[PDB]
Structures are given as C-alpha cells and as structure tokens.
Amino acid sequence: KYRREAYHRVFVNRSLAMEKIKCFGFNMDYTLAVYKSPEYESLGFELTVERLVSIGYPQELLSFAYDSTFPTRGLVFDTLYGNLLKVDAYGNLLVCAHGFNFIRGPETREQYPNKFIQRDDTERFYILNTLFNLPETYLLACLVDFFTNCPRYTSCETGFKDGDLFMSYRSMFQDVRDAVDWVHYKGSLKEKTVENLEKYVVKDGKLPLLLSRMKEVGKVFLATNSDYKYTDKIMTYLFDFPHGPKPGSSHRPWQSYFDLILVDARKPLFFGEGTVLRQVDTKTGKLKIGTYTGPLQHGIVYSGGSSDTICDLLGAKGKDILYIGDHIFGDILKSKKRQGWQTFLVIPELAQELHVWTDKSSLFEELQSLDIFLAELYKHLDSSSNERPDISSIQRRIKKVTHDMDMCYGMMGSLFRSGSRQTLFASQVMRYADLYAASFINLLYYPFSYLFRAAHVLMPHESTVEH
Amino acid sequence: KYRREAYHRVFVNRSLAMEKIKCFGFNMDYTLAVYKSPEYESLGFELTVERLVSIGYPQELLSFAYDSTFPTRGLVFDTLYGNLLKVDAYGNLLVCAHGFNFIRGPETREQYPNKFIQRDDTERFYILNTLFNLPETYLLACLVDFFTNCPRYTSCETGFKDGDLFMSYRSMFQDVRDAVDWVHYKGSLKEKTVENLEKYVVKDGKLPLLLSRMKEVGKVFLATNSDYKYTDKIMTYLFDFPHGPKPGSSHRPWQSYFDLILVDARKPLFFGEGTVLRQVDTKTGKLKIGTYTGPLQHGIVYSGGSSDTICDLLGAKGKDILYIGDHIFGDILKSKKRQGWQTFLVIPELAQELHVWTDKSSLFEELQSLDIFLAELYKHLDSSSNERPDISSIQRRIKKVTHDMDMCYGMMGSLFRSGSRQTLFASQVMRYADLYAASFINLLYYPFSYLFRAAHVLMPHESTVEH
Amino acid sequence: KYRREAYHRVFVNRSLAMEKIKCFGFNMDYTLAVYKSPEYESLGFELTVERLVSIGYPQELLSFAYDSTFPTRGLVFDTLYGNLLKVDAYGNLLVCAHGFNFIRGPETREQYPNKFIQRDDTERFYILNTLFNLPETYLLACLVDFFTNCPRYTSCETGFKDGDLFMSYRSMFQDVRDAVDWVHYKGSLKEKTVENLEKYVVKDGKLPLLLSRMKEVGKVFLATNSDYKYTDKIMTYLFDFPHGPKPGSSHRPWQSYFDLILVDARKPLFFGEGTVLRQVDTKTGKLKIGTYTGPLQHGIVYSGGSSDTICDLLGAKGKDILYIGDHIFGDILKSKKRQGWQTFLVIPELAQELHVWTDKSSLFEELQSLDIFLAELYKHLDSSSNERPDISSIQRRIKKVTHDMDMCYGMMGSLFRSGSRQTLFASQVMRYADLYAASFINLLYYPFSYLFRAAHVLMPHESTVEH
Amino acid sequence: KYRREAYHRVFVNRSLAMEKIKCFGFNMDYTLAVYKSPEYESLGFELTVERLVSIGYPQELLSFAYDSTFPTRGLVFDTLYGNLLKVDAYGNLLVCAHGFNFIRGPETREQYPNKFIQRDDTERFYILNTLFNLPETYLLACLVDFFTNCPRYTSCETGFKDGDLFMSYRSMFQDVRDAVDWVHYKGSLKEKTVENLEKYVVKDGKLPLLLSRMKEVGKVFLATNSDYKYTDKIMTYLFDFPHGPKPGSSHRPWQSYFDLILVDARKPLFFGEGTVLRQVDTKTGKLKIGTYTGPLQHGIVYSGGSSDTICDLLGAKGKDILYIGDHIFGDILKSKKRQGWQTFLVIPELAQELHVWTDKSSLFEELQSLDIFLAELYKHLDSSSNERPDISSIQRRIKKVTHDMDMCYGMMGSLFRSGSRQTLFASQVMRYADLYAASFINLLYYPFSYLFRAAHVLMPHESTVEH
Numbered sequence A, B, C, D: 001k002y003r004r005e006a007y008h009r010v011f012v013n014r015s016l017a018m019e020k021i022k023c024f025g026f027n028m029d030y031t032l033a034v035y036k037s038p039e040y041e042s043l044g045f046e047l048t049v050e051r052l053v054s055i056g057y058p059q060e061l062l063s064f065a066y067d068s069t070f071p072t073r074g075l076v077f078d079t080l081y082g083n084l085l086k087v088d089a090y091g092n093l094l095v096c097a098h099g100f101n102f103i104r105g106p107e108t109r110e111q112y113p114n115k116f117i118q119r120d121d122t123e124r125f126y127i128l129n130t131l132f133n134l135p136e137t138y139l140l141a142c143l144v145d146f147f148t149n150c151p152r153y154t155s156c157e158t159g160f161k162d163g164d165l166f167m168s169y170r171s172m173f174q175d176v177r178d179a180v181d182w183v184h185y186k187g188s189l190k191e192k193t194v195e196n197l198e199k200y201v202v203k204d205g206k207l208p209l210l211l212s213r214m215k216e217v218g219k220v221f222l223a224t225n226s227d228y229k230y231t232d233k234i235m236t237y238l239f240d241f242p243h244g245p246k247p248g249s250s251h252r253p254w255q256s257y258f259d260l261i262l263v264d265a266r267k268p269l270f271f272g273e274g275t276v277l278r279q280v281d282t283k284t285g286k287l288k289i290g291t292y293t294g295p296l297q298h299g300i301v302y303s304g305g306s307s308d309t310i311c312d313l314l315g316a317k318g319k320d321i322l323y324i325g326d327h328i329f330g331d332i333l334k335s336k337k338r339q340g341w342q343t344f345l346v347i348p349e350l351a352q353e354l355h356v357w358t359d360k361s362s363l364f365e366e367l368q369s370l371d372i373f374l375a376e377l378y379k380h381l382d383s384s385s386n387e388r389p390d391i392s393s394i395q396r397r398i399k400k401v402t403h404d405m406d407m408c409y410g411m412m413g414s415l416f417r418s419g420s421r422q423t424l425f426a427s428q429v430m431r432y433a434d435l436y437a438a439s440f441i442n443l444l445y446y447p448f449s450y451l452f453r454a455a456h457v458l459m460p461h462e463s464t465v466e467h
C-alpha cells in the first residue's frame, strides 16, 4: 500500500472526509507557534527556579540546569509520596521514579498496593499532560532529589523535616504550581520570549503557504488563550518573510489569513458557557467598551466568547470544524452540548519517536527474534509435557533490550508506551484526536479532498491469528 | 512464527509466566459449567416472559421466541429512550436499536447530542455485560418493539400509554430486571436445569484431565456464587464419566479435584469485605452449626467468606493466584487492597468470532483492496493539487462490506468491535483480563511452564509505518 | 379585630381582590369530591396490598390494616435507607422513621451527615405530597417494618435478603409505586367507589349553593384529571339532592353549573404543552370523531387540551382565573409562560389541626410559661456574670410538652410544622397558594367583593420587638 | 416576657444552647472590622469609577457620587434587561428599577412574564448579597441611568447602540464585575483604607472585652480571606487602646486573643476541599516554605487550609463551633460533609431597621387601623351579600402608607421585606443563620450559659386565629 514519507504523514484514529471540512480552527501556543527546544523549556525552568528562590527556596536550586532527556510528557506527580509515575490506561504503574531514583520491582508495591493508583483522585495525583508541563516535571524531580540527598534535610515518607518545620510534597507541589503559574502570567516569560524571538519560536514559510490554501477551500479562525499584545507579536514573527504565501508574492499581514481571530479564549471554559463576547481595539490591545455584532468582516478581533459564538459567527456546525491544537480536552459536556468539533492533535514528540522507530530497527528486530525462538522451545509442548527449559538468560535479554529500546526515547520512555504496554497518554490521544501528527504542517502533503481512513487497532486475538 | 491452532489459543493482554502460578481458582457457572446455546438462553427467556405475564404483562409476550442472532453481549440499555446502545470505549454510539428498528445516521443525533452518552450515569444507562444478560437483552428489544407497534398502545419518547396508565421504559426495564432476578433466584430455572442436565450443560472429559494436571503443579479451588445443592448437581454431572482423569483410570468424586471449595461466594462483595466464613454440611446441604477452620484437609466445603480468607486458607499471595472465570470486574479496590489476583477470562463468543475471522477472509481482503486503491487515487496529490476524484461509489462499497462483515456476527455485530471502532466491551476485557480464550479448557494445550508473552497493540503511527 | 369563625376562614398568603375574579376553576378529586376518611384511604390501601400479593409479596401483607394516625402528608421516602423523612423548608431532618421505629437523636447523623438531605435528588428521595399518597405512605412504613422484624428476612442497610434474593428498598418502593398506579388506573378502585358512593364520598348542599353563586358573578369551569364516565358518576352523586341550589328550587344537572367542563386534563402537562383538545361524546362517554370548537355554548364536554386553550375558550386572562384545588404545583414555566392563574389550595387537615390549635391551648400556654420563666432566670445576666443556672429539668419539660403537642396531630405530627420548625410542606404551600382553607366550600362565607389581605409573616426581630 | 433592649438583642432562628459552645470563629472584614458608612462605600465606588474611566468609560462617570440611600442589599441584576430587581423567596418581582426609573405595575409584566424570574439562571441574573456589593449596586443603576438619558446613546432592550458598536448590559456588567474585583485585589482599596484607618474602620473597646470573656469559656479562632499584611494592620488598629480587655489592664497584642489565626482562607472553597495548609512567617508576612504541624501553640499563623483542618487543630467538631460572620453561605455540601458549624450572621442594616420599627410606629399603627376598618365593612357579609362598598380610597391609603413605610428604609425598601412580602434575602438569612444581630458585639449582653430559644414563625392560619 502507498504511504507518504513517514515524517509527512497525518495519522488517523477515526475516519474523516476532508472534502466535508468547512472551517479550520487554530490553537496558537505550541501549534502555529512552536517554541524551540530545549531553549524554551530551559527559559521556563530558570524563571521558575528564580521565583522559587525569591520566595524562600534554598540557593542550590540555581545550580539546576534543565535536562530535556529526563521528562516524558504525561506523567503523574503523586503529592503523597513525591513520585513521578508513568501509568497505563487504567492505573497500573509502569515507571516510578523518586527524584532521580527509579523504583524498580517489589519496593514499588510497598508504596503502591498492586502497583496501582486510582488516577481519578485528583486531590492526590496531578497529571502533567501539556508541553508547558515539561519544565515543571523535571523540576519536581530535581526538588525531590535534592532535598532527599541534602544532609540538612531529614527525609520522611510524605516530605522533609527541617527542625520544627515540615515540608510535604503536597506543599512543595503547590509552590511549584504557583511559581510556574506566576511565571506564565506575571513573570517575564512572555516578555523575554518576545525580545529574542529567533531563539525561542520556530519560523517556516510552510505556515503561510498551508493556511493560504486552507483559506481557498473553507474558513480559517484562531482561538488562542493568549492576549492580543502577545498574539500580535508572535503572529507577526511567524509571518515575517519577504513574501506572502508563495515566493514572489507580496507579503500580507497575518490577520489577513483568518476570517475570525479570537484571543482570551479561556479554553476549556471556552467550550462550555464561555465568557462575554468582547472585542479588542487593535491599536491599544485593550478591550473596546463596545462590541461589533453582525457580519464577519475582516479587521475585527474578539476576546472571550464561546465555541457556540465562534460557531455562529462562522455560520458552521461542530462537524464542519476541524480544531487544530496541541491540547487534549475532556468530553465532560459531549453528552449534552449538541455541537462537537473534529480534532487534529499536534504531538511534537512524534518526530523523534519516528526516528527511533526507523533508525533503531535493530532492537525491534532482535526482540522479534527472541520471541520467535521462545515460541519454538514451547512448540511441541502441551500440558502433558512437564519440561521446564531454562529461559532465564532469554528472559534477561528481553528486559535489557526492551529497556534499551525504552531509553532511546529518554529517561522516562516513550510518550505512548512503556515496554509492551500503552500509556495513559496514548489512550487520551486515541479518545480525543481524530487526526494527529508531529505538526499540523503535514496537512500540506494531503489534498483537501483526501479521505483519511482510520487505522485498525487490533486485540491480541486479532493481531496474532491469520486469515 | 509458530502459533498453536487458532481454536486452541490462549490470548495474552498482559504477559504471564505460568511457572509462577501456585493456585488455580475457578468460577463455576459459564466457566466450568458451560450452558448450551440457544437452549439455556431460551429456558431463561421463557421463564422470564412467563414471570412477567403472571404479574400482568399482555398474553402476546407468550408468542415470543428467544432468538440467538439478535443480541450481542455488552450492550447498554437506555432507560430514558428505551434503546439498546452499542457504544465504544469512550461513549461513542456505534449502534442504536429501538426495539428492532435500527436508528441509522442523523436521527441518532436527534436523541443523542453528539452520538454520545455519559455512560457514568447508572440511573439512566444499564450495561448488559454477562452471559446471563443475553436473554434479558433480547427481551428488552421485544418488549419495546411490541408496545411500539401494538395498536392499543400509544408510544411516547419515554414509554407507552397502557390505557390510562403510563408505562415508562425505565419502569418497564426494572420489571424485566426483577423478573430475571426472580427467575434465577426463586423460580424454576435451576430445577429445570438439573432435571435435564444433558439438554442444558456441556460435558467433556477434557475438564477432569486439565484439572487433574493443574493439581499436579499447584493448589486448586472453586469459588462459586451458587449454593451447594446446585453446585453438587452441576459438578457431579460435569464429572459423570465412567473413568477418572484419563481413560482406564478410576473415577473419583468432583470434590477430590479441589483443595478448597467455596459456595455462596456473593461476588463481587466477596472481593472486598465479603461475608462471614461459613461451613456447609455436605449431607443436608444446609449450613453447619459452626465452622471447623484450620488445616486445609480436603472434605470441608465453605460458604461465604472473602478473597482474603481464601488466600489465608491456601497460604498464598494474590500474584500466586490465577482466577479463571467469565465475569469482568472493576478495579474499585485495586488502589488500597494489597491483594490482587491474576485473571483468565472465558469469552465463549470467541469460537464463532474466530470462525468469521477465518471463513470470511473474502471480506477482510476485499476491504483491504478498497484501501490499496483509495490510497492509489491520492498517491500524487497534496494540498497543492485540487482534483476532487469521485470516491462516493467505492466509499459505498466499503460501507456495504463493513456492514456485511458486522452482520456475520449477528444483528448487533461483533462482541469486540463495530466495523473499525472497538467496543466498550473490548476495552473492559483489556482492563480486566490478563489471559483470555473461548474456554478455560484451552490451557490444556500449553505447558505449565509456559511464558505467555503479551501482544503488542499498535497505535496508528505504529501499525502504518515500517522499520 | 373582627374575624370570621376559625372553621369558616379562608387564609391569605398573598393578598387578593375577589371582585377582580372573572373565572372559577375547579379540581374534582379531593376538591369538589372530598373522599371520606379513613374509609377511602383504607379502600386504596387494601387494593394496593392485594395487588402486591397477586405479584408475590408474602401473605402477611393481608393482615395489615390501614391506620390513619400514622402518616402525615408531605413526607419524604428515602429509597436508599428505606426511611420516611419529615424535613424542613431547607432539607433539615425533623423526623426519621424506619418502619415504625423512630430514629431519635444521634443515630440519625449516623445515616444522615448533618441531619440533612439534598432533596433535589429525585432518584433517591420521593416526596409523598398528595392526599392519594396517604395510603402509600403508611404502606411503605408497614412493608419496611415487617421485613425488618420478620425472622425469615435478613435486614441490610439498603434492603433485605429474601432467601437468595436481595430486595432493595428502592426496588421495593417502585413496586409500591406501580401498585398504587395500577390500582388507581386499572384496578377496581374507581368501580368500588361508584358502587358505594355514600360510603366513600362526602355530600353537602353547600356545594351547589356556592357554585350557583359563583356563576352569578363570573364564569365557572371544571378541569379534572379523571375520565367522563367517572366524572359523571361522581358529579351526579355530589349534586343528587331533591332540589337545586336552594331548598324548594328545582334540581338541575351538574353540567348546568359549568360554562366549560374538561376531563382527561393530564395535569400538570395540562399547564404547559398539554394534549390535543378533544370533545367527549356525552352519550357513550367515548371521544367524538372530531371537536366542534368555537362558541362557549354549554353542553360541550372537552377532553385533554391545555391551560392556554381553557383561557381562549373562556375569553379570559390568567389573573382573571382563580384555580381551586388540592394539588401543589411548581413554578417551572412561570418565568416564560406569560399566563399564570391565581390559586386557592384545599388543605383538609386544616380542620382537625385548627381543632388542636384551639382545644389544646393548655399546652401552647404552658410552653409559653416555660419561656417566660426561662427568660426570667436570665434577666440580670450578661457575658460578665458567670452563673450557670440549672435549666435541664425545665429544658426537659419543654421537650415532653412539644412532643405531646406534636403527637396531638398523629405520629408524624402536624402537616405544617414539627415543634417550632416549619415543614417543607408548609413552604410549598407558601410558594404555591394565594388562598388556602380546609375546604373550598369556605368561600361561601365571604362576599365576592371581598378583599383578602395577606397575613404579615414576621421574622424573629419583628415578632419579638415592640413598636 | 422579659427582653433585653432592642439594640442589644441577639435574634434566634433556630434554638442554640450557649453552654454547648466550645469554639468561637470569626470573620474579619465587616464582622470584627466594621467599615464605616457611607465613607467606605464611597471609597470603593470612586476607585471603581476611576478604573472604569481608565479602561474606556466616558468621563461623566466622575460626576457620580455614591448615594447610600439608593441600594438595598441583596438585589438581583438582570444582565438581559439591565434591571435591579427585588424578588421574594421564590422569584416574584417586588421591585424593578431601570437605572433610577422604578417600573411600577403592568409594564413590568411586559418584560417579566408573571412578574416572575427563575433566579437559578445565574448566566442571566447576579445576586448582590454582600456588603461590598453595595457600591457595585448603586453603580449599576448610575450606569444604566446615564447611558439611557445620554443623547449620544441609543437605548435598546438589551443595551445601547453607539454607531457600529453595541454595549449590552451583560458586557456592561462584566466590566463592572472586573473593575470591582480589580479594585479589591490590585487597586489601592486596601492601601488607602490602611492609611486613614480612623475614617474607614470602627474602633470600640467592647471588641477586646467580649473576645476576652469568650476566651475564658472556650477557644477563639479567626478565618479571614484577607492576607496577613492586611489582617495585622486591621487587627492592630481594632485593638489599639491604652489598655487591654478592661480599663487599667495592660494592653496585649491582638494575636493573643486567638488560639488559631488563619488568613487566606479562600472561603467558601475553605469549607470544602480547601487549599494546602500553609504557615505565614509573621515577620515578612510571606509564606514559610515549611509548616509547623502538631500542637496548638500561640505565635503560629496559618494560610490556606480547610474547615476540617481548623476543626482538627482546635480539637472540635462542627456543632462545637459557632461561626460568626457577615457572609451567607450555601449548603451545597451539607448533605455529605459530616461536619457542620453553627452560625451567627452579622446584619448591620438591622440597626436602622429597628429604628424604623420603633421610631416610625405611627405608620404601623395606622396600617393596623385601616385593616381594622376594612375587616369591619365586610363583617356582616357572606356570599349572599351582593354589596360592593367602595374601598378604593382606603385601598389607595394603604398603598401610600406602606410605600411611606417602605421608603423609611431607603429607595429600595427594607432588607428583609417589601410591603407585606418577605425578600429572597430574608429567606437565606432564615436558612443560614442560627443566630443573627446587627453586630456580634451584642453577645456581650448574654451569659455564656444562655439558652437562645427560636422565634416562632407563623403561617396565616396560625398568626390570625386565637387559642
């Protein structure tokens, strides 16, 4: 079967007829504005450590340097025990690292009955799904690791003693949750991003190309959580080329690419009741007291609003809308809110994941062989056979190799799978995302008539027995 | 790769080393005692209809004949709208049946906001998961269909006018809930099973052979929900052969195969608090005055108890126990109760579903040809090229062929999937079962040294890109 | 101030000028047709018990005798714990009865977190508001009590073991819900009422006198939920006197008193969408082939319809209509449906409750003496003085005397209050009813020019400080 | 019966034994810290207008001067129509003012079907319950009034046109909700309060007196939403006297009056799950990284936390706690959260209310007379009488007089009642408050042994018929 080159591919959870698509919606941060890596994470990391120091934390935090090779996205911080957990779709622990000390085997079960956590218990466990969580994730490890090995800190099971005062991982987590939040919304993160854009944000003429062709088959809108001063800066840079969509054409403003522009969306509340629909005065970047209602002329820019409001202005309905973004949402209203958008989920980790999947075929093959052999020793055996062939050295070599394969993805494994088992993150992707790729940009390699036909997912009795 | 024949396979969700199994636990009903189909469904069906009529439902209910080709296990009854729903792992409706009229396409949105249900509502939706639910599934369809088309009944959104009386589907469903309950627990269902065991229950000497071999390598126990009177009749019939485990050998009683036997288990409550541990007078079948607990001397038959008590009585830890059964439980206590068994789930539908996967390969292969060709019509295309090639006709042949395939399994399709999407049921199997096969009997084809290595389950970007 | 005798009074929640009333609407059942007590309760009680037994409840249910001294109208059945709850306007438990054992003091907290229920849960709690609910109230108590104390039944938190069967209170309640429904709508309850009208229904010539006088000053209509067959029997019995309105005058048919008559009203649905407006063939009692709508010529008897259609047929606006009845509705459409009637609510308990307020004044006055004295023991005291005067004994005499008072109204006390706190029922009366009396008949003592001026309802700082 | 002087009285909704009280909890803002009136409201008003001007609103807003005689607490802003509504306990409109134009009579019904609003519809209606709402309330009127009469503004039904731009009352309301919030939490409101304390906050040596006696019979805690820098300033001023509790005694720090001090409570979330329990470093007023757990020694000061945490540290249970405050809470968790505090609700408006109730007895009397007379004209009348005595001039004089009585409380009537009918605010008081007074300070006139015995609330048939 013909398939495009792996790195251009859009992958398909649920089938989707692109001719049917009338409106393309865009997330900005980490979707059109891909922040550069590991620079941007380093930036967030350092400002968060500097905020933690300024509010009391010890100076050794300034020795911390963000390491992009530790965190995998989607881990669970357990504020009871201070652990970064990699669980599966149902709650089973696949990885448990205390600080940087990976708890391997039976001693996990000591803390976690049945190697199992009830991931609905959000008072105890915080999911770290988003791309911005990456620094917070490495940081939580650094903090747990440092205090655990710092002689002036007595480690107990839920935190650390220091004389009369006790700092629990729950208190420690909230300080980190505050700092992070403070950095995003009151620190210099936006500011220092906007003043060295070439170091932090990607630029690529494929962005104005693809959006322009999208605008010839349908409408294009932007629904971003950032304000207008931030969005104007970021979007001006992404469209700063000495031409427009194609070489030779005049450059045009980034606004000219969107039928509707909405900032201050307040997602996910955006997707329910919303906030009052407001309008931004594009000169001050402040909200106008008035708001222009009616037709959909260009030059207007909205703040607040609702999915319904955006859908009414565009004159669409949910299934006419392909929402393109890096965030995974719930369906807490899908059973009442009659309107339901399609989804394209951006998953940047896929780029390096696909490199491992190809550039490391020797480990996938050699696992295939150790399983061939295994399935051969037991060939002529049934329950009558009482032979116990030694397979320890084999069972050893499968661990060492699937661990090697794991570590190709970094110290916390693949985003989508630990060893054989799938992650909780993979399931949310399969639940939420009709389409997904490493960047939406890969839509450029598909015609807008394209029929995306879902990939079959097989249960064991389907993947391992022939027709 | 070498694989055992499809109909002897045990399938592996999570990997398992059998050499580490020190106890084999058995469900009785629909595990060891496979009731014959469609006879046993019919017998429950007719007694339930007969119980309903004896409380006032019209005499036309007696014209019903149970029909095995309609129900698929695991469907959801909507008590609001009187519909049988086949949903996916996340709540997406795959199939809506009001009685026998299948709601196809857009008028499902009319009743279900995004073709979606919030299946966490155990006041509106009822899962029909179990093999005993099959009659009650088909009954619900018949009842809603009859009152819909009976001229003397006015049909409403949420029920029927029965003259001056309003019969809500929810009130009608609880009537069917109580009748099934009453028939199983107080009617003639058990008695009419015992007095014609050959008509209702499967027999096979493979059962004592296997259980004899399990007792060579580990302890063996029976934890059933039935009473000892019924359990003696059933287990004695199943072991009525003019020889013991092998041919030529002396027959031994069915008790002799179990180091522990437990009736009145009251699962799932069994698996948490439980009930008081009782001891059955094997003679009367009534409970003893006390309970001689202590040594594991076979001859004692317990009533009630808890998972905890079995493990103590057998002197074993959870991970030593492989619990063999046909019921899917939830991990509601997995995060606290330090003891957690391994599981083998018996899924009988697998036999005839494996038949369709093999004797209907004309359809799988043709759908694949329609997918090779589809991919070929778009080989040289991109967002640049604006050809709109007509695919509607071939896009019609894919519907008819996936409908034909879905219909190879009955009117509600495969247990595990609808066309391409996986069923809620498939995912509950995935969460619960370490191993699964059409019958537990299939263990007989594997050495008890076997390493069951799990099947890789691929995401779209895994199944669709090469190494 | 001059007031009419207590037993002739009409009480005023919201003020009303009768001279502005242009239509008088009548509920039939338990308004115009006051069923005799305890005979009619008994007759429904015995048929419901007899319906339950015919579907499998034990024969001891036939030993039950309906007992008028137990139930108070407006109680809440908890389907979880099988309790009859008397709560206040905000959800505070005043009284908890498991069967006939009254839960007093601290073990109510054991079942109810703050002696409180979230009465918005129409899946767990059921309000028993209506005069037809009285039998079903007492029945629920008997049933829970019998299975609690019957030796062959094991009692659980949420139900009973009926041998191998679990009978939940919720499942037991819906059985009683359907039986009452069936008895009213399909059993012999109506027929056994018609064939001994003198035993079951009150008669009084004050009824035609009043309705004759209303027709002098305004239009008059009947909007009942019963059918015309039943309505003819009932209304003809009520008007069977050997004279018309006054003595000496010629009798006239019961129809002659109504400008419009409406059966099969299907209230409350009547009050919104409604049903199609139908016309009854007065001869057969079956529906005509069509409906001759138009002029208001008396002789036409309608079926179905809506509040809207009555107003159109009478050519009147809501505020012209005074709806006389015994049922309390909710303001679920009051904020949109521009049409809203005035209301007179019939509360029969008021007769004997007015008796206790007058013939038990020995108790009210003594409680007041205990309050004068209590206030006297603390006259010269403040946060300065630290005397702790012993009041426990007098604080005991206040309990026994408020219990004695509460018991002057039956085992569940007054309809409107428990000791000092007001009942949920009292506040629903307050929300719904403009006027209220023990019977609508009491209008007869007021001129149709009367200005009903509302009673001031004082807050503590109003009732307890002088001008 | 003996009663203390009206202005010293504590009023009693539900009975409460003060000997039973172990812990006294305190709200700060508007409870211990009574802000002076109308100065403090003026202050908030002006800063909010200045914030509205700075973000775009027209300069004429600076002409606004806060008028304390317009707002009554507890009104409903309807963002659809821009109306301040005074409704009753169930949704019935008692007052409707558009800006300063009081809609009186039938034209209300044009906008409000049945003079009724569904007050649960919080997307449309905002309740203005709190003391801080007073300026926002007057302001909403000023804004609606100004734009309505400003020639350059075209008034429509849901807002105002100004050429191409439309400003809806919903957009207008959110700007006011923002400004207000901004003033409280980022403007100079706290700041300018703290720098002229003698103009804004009341001081009274009865505060340290009463708290000291409370500390001799039980524990005292503070649970305030303000931070520690604000709380220290405010509390130091309230206890700035040249003595301690009594004349002649040494002054002691305000902290010495509390066993537990909690700031940053985040009520009402405080009363559910809470926030992490933190500790404040009393020198910086910033949060310590550590937190001291264990005994309850003085010198420690908490931030965040939970009702449960405060209750555990104090070693109490809900009914041991009398929570003293000016805010009215819901019981959204009262049906699950096992712990439930008693309540003392501070209602400052009561001071002036009680002056009207006494200093204006001539209007209450003259209404009593017009009702005596009314009840006399209709004395010798029944339904036989067809006399229509003219009572228009009387019915006129009752309106003019109950309007005069109303206006003694200000332009929007009493806090607790409009004319005869009670307000929605009065009902929440009766639901939430076990005790209430104009200031908690009145506890000083009651012994701590005092039994507060609820005031009887009477239904019409109880207040108007004798024993």
Ligand SMILES: [Mn+2]
Residues within 6 Å of the ligand: A027, A028, A029, A030, A031, A325, A326, A327
């Ligand atoms: Mn984003």
Ligand SMILES: [Mn+2]
Residues within 6 Å of the ligand: B027, B028, B029, B030, B031, B325, B326, B327
């Ligand atoms: Mn079973």
Ligand SMILES: [Mn+2]
Residues within 6 Å of the ligand: C027, C028, C029, C030, C031, C325, C326, C327
């Ligand atoms: Mn009625």
Ligand SMILES: [Mn+2]
Residues within 6 Å of the ligand: D027, D028, D029, D030, D031, D325, D326, D327
């Ligand atoms: Mn306050």
